[PDB]
Each structure stands twice: as structure tokens, then as C-alpha cells.
Amino acid sequence: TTQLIQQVSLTDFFRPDIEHAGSIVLILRHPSDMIGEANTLTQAGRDPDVLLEGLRNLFNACTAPWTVGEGGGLRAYVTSLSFIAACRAEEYTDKQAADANRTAIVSAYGCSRMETRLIRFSECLRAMVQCHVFPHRFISFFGSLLEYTIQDNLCNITAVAKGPQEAARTDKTSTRRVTANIPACVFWDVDKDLHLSADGLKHVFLVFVYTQRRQREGVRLHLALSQLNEQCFGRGIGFLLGRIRAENAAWGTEGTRALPLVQLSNDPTSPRCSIGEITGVNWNLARQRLYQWTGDFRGLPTQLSCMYAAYTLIGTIPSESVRYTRRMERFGGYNVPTIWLEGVVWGGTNTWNECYY
Amino acid sequence: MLHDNVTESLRRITASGGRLNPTEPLPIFGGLRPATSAGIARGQASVC
Amino acid sequence: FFKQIRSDDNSLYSAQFDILLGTYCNTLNFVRFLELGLSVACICTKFP
Amino acid sequence: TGFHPGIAFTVVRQDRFATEQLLYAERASESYFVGQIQVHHHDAIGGV
Amino acid sequence: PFEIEVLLPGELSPAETSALQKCEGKIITFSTLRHRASLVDIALSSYYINGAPPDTLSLLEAYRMRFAAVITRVIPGKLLAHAIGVGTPTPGLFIQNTSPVDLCNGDYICLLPPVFGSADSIRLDSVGLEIVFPLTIPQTLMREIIAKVVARAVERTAAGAQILPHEVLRGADVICYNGRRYELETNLQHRDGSDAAIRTLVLNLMFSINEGCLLLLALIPTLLVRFPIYETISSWISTSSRLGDTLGTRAILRVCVFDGPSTVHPGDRTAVIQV
Amino acid sequence: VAYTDRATLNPWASQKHSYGDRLYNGTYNLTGASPIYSPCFKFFTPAEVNTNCNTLDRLLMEAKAVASQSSTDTEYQFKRPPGSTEMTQDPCGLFQ
Secondary structure (H helix, E strand, C coil): CCCEEEEEEECCCCCCCCCCCCEEEEEECCCHHHHHHHHHHCCCCCCCCHHHHHHHHHHHCCCCCCCCCCCCCCCCCEEEHHHHHHHCCCCCCCHHHHHHHHHHHHHHCCCCCCHHHHHHHHHHHHHHCCCCCCCCCCECCEEEEEEEEECCCEEEEEEECCECHHHCCCCCCCCCCCCEEEECCCECCCHHHHCCCCCCCEEEEEECCEECCCCCCEECCEEEEECCCCCHHHHHHHHHCHHHHHHHHHHCCCCCCCCCHHHHHHCCCCCCCCHHHHCCCCCCCCCCCCCCCCCCCCCCCCCCCCEEEEECEEEEECCCCCCCEEEEEEECCEEEEEEEECCCEECCCCCCEEEEC | CCCHHHHHHHHHHHHCCCCCCECCCCCCCCCCCECCCCCCCCCCCCCC | CCCCCCCCCCCCCCCCCCCCCCCCCCCCCCCCCCCCHHHHHCCCCCCC | CCCCCCCCCCCCCCCCCCCCCCCCCCCCCCCCCCCCCCCCCCCCCCCC | CCEEEEECCCCCCHHHHHHHHHCCCCEEEECCCCCEECCCCCCHHHCCCCCCCCCHHHHHHHHHHCEEEEEEEEECCEEEEEECCCCCCCCCCEEECCCCCCECCCCEEEEECCCCCCCCEEEECCCCEEEECCEEEEHHHHHHHHHHHHHHHHHHHHHHHCCCCCCCCCCCCCCEECCEECCCCCCCCCCCCCCCCCHHHHHHHHHHHHHHHHHHHHHCCCCCCCCCCCHHHHHHHHHHHHHHHHCCCCCCEEECCCCCCCCECCCCEEEEEEC | CCCCCCCCCCCCCCCCCCHHHHHCCCCCCCCCCCCECCHHHCCCCCCCCCCCCCHHHHHHHHCCCCECCCCCCCCCCECCCCCCCCECCCCCCCCC
């Protein structure tokens, strides 16, 4: 009834040893595509190679740094949700839960070359949202972790693709069943902000809030759980994010007379330009003036410079009146508040809807 | 060095009179691997 | 530790145990002086 | 040009060789436990 | 499981029936689903409209209105296929990569008419028909391919219409994926598909954009510090909407690779799951 | 230690920050991006070790055919490919 996906990768962003069974795991595209997209989509005036500076130092502080460029299949493919949650923990509203998860992921990992890795990833995302290379097209989604095998610094993991959560058999734990586990920092239900009844079926989304200013950019990651419709979620999110939308509309771009067309077309006795002269023999004295309009529009907010969020459907919960449970348990050698979701069917294609308003 | 021509001629001269050298274009954000040669003679060469 | 499971859950189960594989020891032997060949180098006798 | 400056050098080189080894073990060197086998059905590219 | 059987023709040349065996895991597209069918509907002859061969704009419409299927195996006198349609639980579904771009795990599949180069296809001179197979590309790359190929066409019209060309450029366009650059359309000459298949596409795309960026400039003149005026609005909405439905993006398959190589090159076959 | 009549043989590659030490230590990461192997790396690295048993037990436990540090496919002796599991006995490396 369910399907599985296997993949081997480097363990510098993901550790299937400490991560609990049932957590979310994401994958990354090849970093070589970032520069090819940045040098062509960077806003006019901005420096396009600050991303390259921010990117090179990331792998310089990562094992096997001489293995970038060929993509033979031995790169850091997958990553964990808690990793990004800890990298951007200074931006979530739940101060204590954020910093607790941060120190926990620092201690449970190598804890020697981990803090440097985190700050490199932090400004890496900061430079990612500096040239309109938004990190919602480079971060895909995998199902919850089910089984793993590791020998040293290289792991083979398998996760569910789509279907019921407790329809698999992990077959090495105490029980043969697992449930979805998430850090309490990313969880954010919108219906209890929008003040509507929470009964019935609810969808799951991932959002990527963007802040665009001068030398100050921010990117969070929230796992929203709402009963709102497939497309109506966009109109719902704008009501809560109305501030950042207006901030971006004014601080997004930092790098002329009208014409009365309908007026002079409603009235006659205007200079006409019949097709007889556009045939193409002397098409300069025919169009000598005909108008001037002195018109040009170069610097204006595009629909891409005012974007502030991008969501995507992941799964639903058919059981009405969900009863998600939040509690603190040990994660390595530290305790972190995790929320436990039961009976969630994965599915849905990876299509991102961008909320630019 | 403060002068780019200095280090460029340095790398050029060093590549001259050797076997393994970085490729001429010198790509940015790469691994800097030498160009593969034809068949091998008598075993894997060892660096000194 | 309170619990509120419904008519069923998945954790009503999952036995797990540590086992012992037995112990092992060793026994020493005893040596007597007369059984050795060195006893033919002296005339042993008692004197309370 | 062949002018010898006032400096000397030492070289270091590492090589590897294939060799045939020889192993000896004791009678009761290890305790070995074998469990029971499991079957796992799964899909494939043409079949299962 | 719902399967469709394509009846192989009699008296086929050994060179043709051989090449048909090569395209094992390729995608065909059926007009109306039935357990038995001929070769006429698979061939290009069923695709062309108004007598003339089909147009890339129409090919996009054809792929939406028409139902797709996947070949599974070829018999010396029989051809079978499975559907991606209603609910059929097709087991061991594998497809062959036809696009020059690589694919990885967790990538969704979309269909696109051949735009880059000349479409490779089986040609049957004995019966007089040919079978054209569609391209399979990832989703994240689809929206940018269609935007680059049509922007290139407007360039050529600009260089010709303007008395002088504005030749100062950045070099050559290229799409990169998994650290591999494609470098499409090196030369300026060899206008094989400049205005051959994408002529009507760039035409409709050049008008609806011109009205949108002008109707606003003629409705409220505050932006930059006898007449219908309503029929134009209804005509613009109806047109811009329709052009939006055709230039859609709907995934049809997902690359689910178990116990195998992650990345796949053009020409290899991999197991996919019905989305 | 070996020759108890002089400090070092050459005073240019044996100090805390001598030229040879700065060139390769393993803790300075000067040749991090270089894909070629360097045989002189195992002689300039402090090789941290904790004291748990006596020197004889530690010596007898070190020689256990540790993993390789090169490649058997290329012809330039590149660095060890990540994931390749082949054990090669390494004498004269635990003796320096």
C-alpha cells in the first residue's frame, strides 16, 4: 500500500543515527546550478558573485572539499528539517524552543566543526535570497525516515514516498510502527490564528517566508497544518503576513508622462497614420511625431521582487478532530520539545505556489 | 601576489616541465583535477 | 505517568530484553616440593 | 639555468604492494549466533 | 489493470520490426481508450489538423485532450501497452529517458513537444506512417525551457525588424541541471524550427502580452507621473485565460528508484511510480 | 630522543611553526582542496591518542590493517575516495 525510496549520501547535513524515526528529510539540488541561475537572474546593480563567496566557504568547511564540480553521485544529497530549523533558529518566535534545538543539534553532532558549518549555511541562505535565487526550487521533499544503515560518514537510508504513515514495518525498533515527529519551533497552525473551527480533514503545507532589505534578509521554514482549501491558503496567509508584504513592496528594489490613448481615439481630428505609409517605403517622415510620450519604465517592483512566501501541499489527515501531542523527550543527550502527528497520508506533487502580493 | 601576471606566469612556467597540471581554463568553484591521459604503461604513478 | 490511549494503539506491545550467555572461570593447580626434581639436591627434614 | 642555490632537499615517496598473507586461529575462537530468515517483497523494473 | 493492445501490421520489413523493439519503454498517446486499436491513431497522421501537419501550439493542446499510455513489450506480431489513465495499478512501470537532460530521484515527469532539435522517430515507409514520441522533462526545468525558446524567437524578429541589430549580448544561452550545461542552438543560421513549428506560438504570445501591458496604461494614466472599452476587456480576459490553460504544468509521473542508480542519463530506463 | 646530542636535524621543518610544518600539518588545512595524495602528511600530524592501557597494549592494538589512503583505479594516486572500504596493512607508519 506504500512505496519506499533509497539513496546514499554524505552525512554532513544529516545523521540517521541521532534523528528520530519518522522525522522529515529533504534533499538538495546540485549547487552548480545556483551560479548558472544567479548570474542570469540577479537584479541589476547588485553584485552576482556574493553567492559564490558564500557558497565556496560552505564546502571549504565540509569533508571531501575536492569533490565539487563533477557530481558523480557522492555529494550531500539529503538533509533534515531540524537542521534548517537550527540554522535559522534566531528568527522563530519561540525563543527557548529554537535555541534548545540549536544546542541539541550542535552537541549531538561532531560539535567540533559544527558551529562553523551552521554559520556558513546561514549566510549561504542569506546570499541565496540576495539575487532572487529563492530556496524554494532547490529544496525538495522526502517522506519520513523508515530505515537506515551507516558504516562511516556515508549512509544508506530509505523513507516512505506516499501513503499511510503506520502502514510500514520498521522491524528493528521496539514496535514496528512510527509516527511523524517535528520540532516545536516550525509548527504553526493558521486556523487558530484565523479563528475558525478545527474539525474534519486538514492539509499540510511548507512555507518559505522571505524578507528583502539592504544587507538584512531572512528566511524561515514553517510546517503549516490547516483545513483551508488548496488555493485559498494563499489568500489566508496574506492576512497574517500583511506587514512583510508591504515592507518588501517598498524595500525590494534599490538598484515618464502618460498618454491619452482613449481620449484621442474617442475624438476625431487627430493625426492619422493610415496603413498606406506603414507599407514600408518612407516610414520615418510618416511617423515623425504622431506623438512623443517621452515614456520609459525601468525601475519598478516586479512580481518577483515582492514575493514573500511559497507553499506546497504535502499531505492530509482524514481522521477528523486531530489530537496532535506535544512533549519533551531526549534527543541524543538533550531534551527538545517535539510534536507528534499520527495517521498522516503523504502524497501530492511537488508544485510551489508563490504568494507575491 | 599583488600582481596577477606574476602568479599567472609562475603557474605557466611551473606547468611547463611537468606531467600533472591543472587545466588551462582554471574553472571557478571546481575540483581542479588534471586532464586524463591515454593508457597506462607499468602501474599507478606515485607522487614525491 | 498518565495515559489516555483509545480502544487500541501501537504501543500495547514491543517486548525487548537483555540476555546473559553464561559465565566462565578457571581452576589453579597445586605443586608439591617432593614432586619436583629439585628435591634430589638437598636432604629435607623437620625440626619442630 | 642550472645554478645551484644554497639549499638542499629531501624527498618522500610512498608505494604499495600486493601480498599473500597467512592466518592462524584457535579452536574455540568465537561464539556465533544465527537467527531466522525473512522475506521482503518489492517491485522492480520489469518484475519483482 | 487496464491494458491497450496495438495490432502489429502484417508484411513488415525486418529492419522496421527490429527498430520497433528498441523503443521498449516509450510513451504513446491515445485519443479514445479501447482494448484494441490500430496504428493510425498512434501515427502522426491522426495528430495533424486542418490537413496541414500539426503545430507546436496544437501539439500542446493535443497532449492535454489526448490520453497517454506506455509501451511495455513487443512481440514479433503483437504490441502491448499500459495506460496512465483512470485507476489501473500498473506493476513494474519503467520508462526510457528521451530528453538530453538527466533525471534524479524524486523528480516529477512532464510531457513536452520536441523543441530543441529534430525529433527522432520511427519511420515506416512500407505502410507509409511514422510514430513520433514526446519528450520527458522534469517539472522544475519545464517552465524555463518554454520561456527561453520563445524569447529567442522574438530576438530574431527584432534583429530583422529593426534597421540595426542590438547585437551586444552576454554570449550563448544554456540550461544547467545536475552540474551539466546543454548549450542549445550554437549558431545563428540553420533556422530549422525558428519559424517552422513555433511561429504561431510566438504570435499569440506577442499579442496577449502587448494588450496587458497596454490596457492598463490606457485605463488608468496615473501610473507614470466610438470606443468599446468593455469588449476589449472581455476579449482580453477570455484570451489570456485560454493561453494560460494550454501553457500548463501537470506532472504525470514520479521517478521512484529503489536499489538502483540515483541519476539516469539520456537513453537509460528507470522505474517510475504512477502519481 | 633518538639522538641525545642535538635538538633537530634540520631546524626548518621541525619547530612549532617552521616552514615544513606550515606547509602541511593537517590541522592548518592548506591543501584541503587538492585532490592529490601527500605521503608526508602522516609524519607531521600530532595523531592525538588517549592513555587507557599501557604502551605495549596500545602498540599491539594499533596494528590492525587500517583503511587505505589512496585509489586503485586512477593513475595519479588521488586521495581516498569517500566510501571505498579496502583495508591495507600499514607498517612503518606506527613507528614514524
